[PDB]
Design a protein around this ligand. Structure first.
Ligand SMILES: [Zn+2]
Lengths: 104, 83, 138, 99, 124, 208
RNA sequence: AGCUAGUUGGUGGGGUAAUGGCCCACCAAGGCGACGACGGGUAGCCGGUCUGAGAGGAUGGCCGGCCACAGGGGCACUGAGACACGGGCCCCACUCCUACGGGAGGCAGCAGUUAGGAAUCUUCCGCAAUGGGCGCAAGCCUGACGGAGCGACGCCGCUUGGAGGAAGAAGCCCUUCGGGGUGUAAACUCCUGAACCCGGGACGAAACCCCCGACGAGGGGACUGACGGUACCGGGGUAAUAGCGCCGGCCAACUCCGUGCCAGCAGCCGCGGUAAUACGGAGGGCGCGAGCGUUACCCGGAUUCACUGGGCGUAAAGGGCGUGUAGGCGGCCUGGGGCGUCCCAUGUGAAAGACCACGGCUCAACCGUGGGGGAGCGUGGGAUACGCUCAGGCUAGACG
């Protein structure tokens, strides 16, 4: 079962490849509540088909470059960087909270 | 060269073996592809030797020069005796 | 706003049952009524009914207790001695059949909430399923 | 001391000289095709490429290259040669490359 | 702690604080005494105590304590530290191995002869 | 090595009567007669209200010394029990009763595990003919516990197996004399054994 | 607290069995980060181990599985295979060598040697078995191995005897001076007969090979065991090692002399300054027994890091107050989806271990065969109460 994955297209601004956010839930190993963690896979996109703020599928694959081992099996649904916006912001605050703090 | 021999499991003067199938390249008592029988030297029981050629066949249907003392034991249960 | 009815309900009840109240309405909802349907049914309150205080739909839970008592303190024994919203949100709690417990050596229940509807524990084993562990009366 | 069976070192060495040499041939000779090809040398290129090809599988006939190596090396080559003749080409000896 | 505080931060472990940095957690440390002084105890109870600041075979050194009535410890006997203290003599983190090396338990012993190391007698 | 020493002593201190004393523990001689008080200098002096603990201790001791068995076993055996399915209290006694030696004794080939065990360690006995001795021998149910040939021709034995007529043999036992044999009919149970010990407390002393 | 230049990716190519920035060329300007990057610290990970009611903590010795390492560093040739423990090249520290040019060296293999240490052995036996390598084979090679020795290092079995035997010895403590205690204890009476001695004395081993006949199947027959002439089987065969800790409370077992804040005990609160059951010995007493006691470390008790299972007015503990990012939490109703969630099938969960039944060495420790369980994950399928989610509605929350 070559792994498959629905996730989001947080970023394209590179060559033929794409950034993908892939949220995830699972019970706290000990404190039970269901924590919602995340990971940024890099899918290989040829015709540069898939675009920013796209839900899509990723698939385990034969390498294309280190830090780059998946592909875009499909486009689940277009338009909705509302998720990106969040991603975008997550890292937005960041840089600020160093010796002064993020922002809002 | 997937052999079929005996690994030791007995004890200090109570040797008990399993008729395994390793690869030789692996210790006598180390991991293995599958057991298929036990041999008791001191034969203090009425089963000091069992086997299951039910398998040995396929298991000999491919490589596996069974140790001389392998075919031996196997011989009693005669994985062979094709009358 | 409530942050979790179920729990809330259980309490309204808990809080009421402790002053020997005739009844205590609980804001109506699909679920709840359920829990009561059992709670009640299981002989933990004469039952409940649907009453619209301010045309706003509620559920009158009809609490019940034991008989008056001897010596100092004629307060009846409590019918529902205990109650605890186990799986609250903020920390959800699902358990699978072999996971269901034995509330009070068996003199008390637990309310799983399976895919076969809400049900007691002895009843969970029945349809042999497990679910989200709800309240836990005894 | 004197681990006799050491031999091999000797052997290894000897066998080496062989291996290296076998290969150097191909390289030095293969480029011969490329260079030629690129230029537009119908035959010779095609020609010598054969010589390579063989000497290559030849190589890969002994514990020199063997494996897919051959292929690669081989393919790698003609592949290289082929497209290269997009200059007027016209495969003469042909042989090597079918069409 | 709202679960979350736990998922988020979670209980901080512990941390043991070894009381015998006579290192390697070994139980006995060879050594050569330096001073063989003698001190008084803490407020509660008094009496001259036979200490023994020893230089350990591991760059360390302490205020070795010596038990038993009298002793044969010389300013340069090979000793052996082994833990212990004295809630009387502040700063005395160990004890001595009478019987081992230059130590041999008190010669006037008869009872708990394991401790205070003296062998066994030939009574009758 | 076990005990070896003033046994009847054990009695006086353990309080009750201890039959580890073969015979004699049957008439003005078990010491327990007009000298039952415990050993020691004060001995015959007051006995401070036993510690809610001492109790578990002693009571245990008792049921141990009785068999004159090694603690490392009397305890290691306890675990073997608890482990096992069944009212532990029972089980223990059960197994603590199949000690080839005690076994023998309960039969009558001797009058005390103390005079028994030895009688055991000289091949003088046999579990199903092919004999044994290791007192620490678990006798399953339904076993032949006959004498050592060379022993049949033996005073004590003969005498012991002799006086053996009027006295009975516990409901899970059955030998004779006209065969110096025997048999482990079945694992006993509390009742079966009169044992002046409260197993429950014992069960307890091993929770500290 | 911010890291990044082969650094992120593209095209083309080299390289390998093979993908790949694995490497190189040129191009784009990206990659990663509080869901904790980067740095510093410690560390081989696992099975399993210990401990715990468990959840959990702590660990990873021996045995099994993977990994990296072979004086410290780098490169590669030979090959199915390595970057190669007992192969090679260089480089640095080091020992030995030397006609001073110039060389030889690796025990983190069995064993031994020295050194640091609290501390960890035998320079033995064997090719019999099991396995490994080459060989047609015979057959050699094997410090892998099967054994023995060494160590109370752990675990299991065992002897130091057994029955009778004084209203009760002598010697040794206590005293109301009548007497109490060590004691059935011993002495002694017979009884057994550890060790020790005499004889016999294996399983472990039947295959390779010979013969047979088609070097096939089936059948005969050669020979070999280190341990070891040990274990054991029959005979005779002498009553024949006990020690250590502790005895004020937790904590079990009290007396006397000595003893004077000294001598010393100590895990804790504490005892000694003339009557100390606490310091020293004896009398006895308790505990366990070839062991007992200490020392260090891990778990427990410690619900004292609290998921199970803690708290915050005055004991430690609410942020000087706000607005609000990310983040966590969400009302009543219907439908879709079925990701969380539950369920069944199957696959996987090696072996040993641990649970269980029978079995084997006289028992047990140890050992074998069998059975069961096993969270977790993979593929299919099913459920839809709950959580999410997607679309429609309402108005008790919010706002206007
Ligand atoms: Zn008696």
């Amino acid at each position: 079962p070559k792994k498959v994955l629905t996730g989001v297209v947080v970023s394209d601004k590179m060559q033929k490849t794409v950034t993908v956010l892939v949220e995830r839930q699972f019970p706290h190993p000990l404190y039970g509540k269901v924590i919602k963690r995340s990971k940024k896979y890099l899918a290989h996109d040829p015709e540069e088909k898939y675009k920013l703020g796209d839900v899509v599928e990723i698939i385990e694959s034969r390498p294309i470059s280190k830090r780059k081992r998946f592909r875009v099996l499909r486009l689940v649904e277009s338009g909705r960087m509302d998720l990106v916006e969040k991603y975008l912001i997550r890292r937005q605050n960041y840089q600020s909270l160093s010796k002064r703090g993020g922002k809002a | 060269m997937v052999k079929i021999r005996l690994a030791r499991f007995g004890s200090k003067h109570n040797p008990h073996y399993r008729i395994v199938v390793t690869d030789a390249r692996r210790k006598r008592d180390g991991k293995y592809i599958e057991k298929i029988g036990y041999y008791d030297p001191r034969k203090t029981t009425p089963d000091w030797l069992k086997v299951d050629v039910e398998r040995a066949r396929y298991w000999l249907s491919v490589g596996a020069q069974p140790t001389d003392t392998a075919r031996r034991l196997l011989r009693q249960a005669g994985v062979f005796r094709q009358e | 706003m409530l942050t979790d009815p179920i729990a809330d309900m259980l309490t309204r009840i808990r809080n009421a049952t402790r002053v020997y109240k005739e009844s205590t309405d609980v804001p109506a909802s699909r679920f709840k009524e359920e829990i009561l349907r059992i709670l009640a049914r299981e002989g933990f309150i004469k039952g409940y009914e649907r009453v619209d205080v301010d045309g706003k739909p509620y559920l009158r839970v009809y609490l019940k207790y034991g008989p008056r008592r001897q010596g100092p303190d004629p307060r009846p024994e409590q019918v529902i001695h205990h109650i605890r919203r186990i799986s609250k949100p903020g920390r959800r709690v699902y358990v699978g059949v072999k996971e269901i417990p034995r509330v009070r050596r068996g003199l008390g229940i637990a309310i799983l909430s399976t895919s076969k509807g809400v049900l007691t524990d002895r009843e969970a084993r029945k349809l042999g399923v497990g679910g989200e562990l709800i309240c836990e009366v005894w | 001391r004197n681990l006799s069976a050491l031999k091999r070192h000797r052997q290894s060495l000897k066998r080496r000289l062989r291996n290296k040499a076998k290969k150097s041939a191909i390289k030095t000779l293969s480029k011969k095709a490329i260079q030629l090809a690129q230029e537009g040398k119908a035959e010779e290129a095609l020609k010598i490429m054969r010589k390579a090809e063989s000497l290559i599988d030849k190589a890969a006939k002994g514990s020199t290259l063997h494996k897919n190596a051959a292929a690669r090396r081989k393919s790698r080559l003609m592949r290289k040669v082929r497209q290269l003749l997009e200059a007027a080409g016209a495969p003469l000896i042909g042989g090597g490359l079918s069409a | 702690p709202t679960i979350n505080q736990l998922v988020r931060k979670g209980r901080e472990k512990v941390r043991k604080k070894s009381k015998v940095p006579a290192l390697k957690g070994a139980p006995f440390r060879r050594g050569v005494c330096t001073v063989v002084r003698t001190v008084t105890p803490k407020k509660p109870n008094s009496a001259l105590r036979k200490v023994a600041k020893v230089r350990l075979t591991s760059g360390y050194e302490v205020t070795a304590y010596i038990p038993g009535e009298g002793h044969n410890l010389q300013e340069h006997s090979v000793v052996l530290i082994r833990g212990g203290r004295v809630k009387d003599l502040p700063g005395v983190r160990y004890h001595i191995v009478r019987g081992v090396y230059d130590a041999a338990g008190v010669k006037d012993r008869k009872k708990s002869r394991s401790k205070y190391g003296t062998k066994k007698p030939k009574e009758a | 090595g076990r005990y070896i020493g003033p046994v009847c002593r054990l009695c006086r201190r353990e309080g009750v009567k201890l039959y580890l004393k073969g015979e004699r523990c049957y008439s003005p001689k078990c010491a327990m007669e007009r000298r039952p008080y415990p050993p020691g200098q004060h001995g015959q002096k007051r006995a401070r209200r036993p510690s809610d603990y001492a109790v578990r201790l002693r009571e245990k001791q008792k049921l141990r010394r009785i068999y004159g068995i090694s603690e490392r076993q009397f305890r290691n055996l306890f675990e073997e029990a608890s482990k096992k399915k069944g009212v532990t209290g029972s089980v223990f006694l059960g197994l603590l009763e199949s000690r080839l030696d005690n076994v023998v004794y309960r039969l009558g080939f001797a009058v005390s595990r103390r005079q028994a065990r030895q009688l055991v360690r000289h091949g003088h006995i046999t579990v199903n003919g092919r004999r044994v001795d290791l007192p620490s021998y678990r006798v399953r149910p339904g076993d032949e516990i006959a004498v050592a040939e060379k022993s049949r021709n033996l005073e004590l034995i003969r005498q012991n197996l002799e006086a053996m007529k009027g006295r009975k043999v516990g409901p899970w036992l059955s030998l004779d004399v006209e065969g110096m044999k025997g048999k482990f009919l079945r694992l006993p149970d509390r009742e079966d054994l009169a044992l002046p010990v409260n197993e429950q407390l014992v069960i307890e002393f091993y929770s500290r």
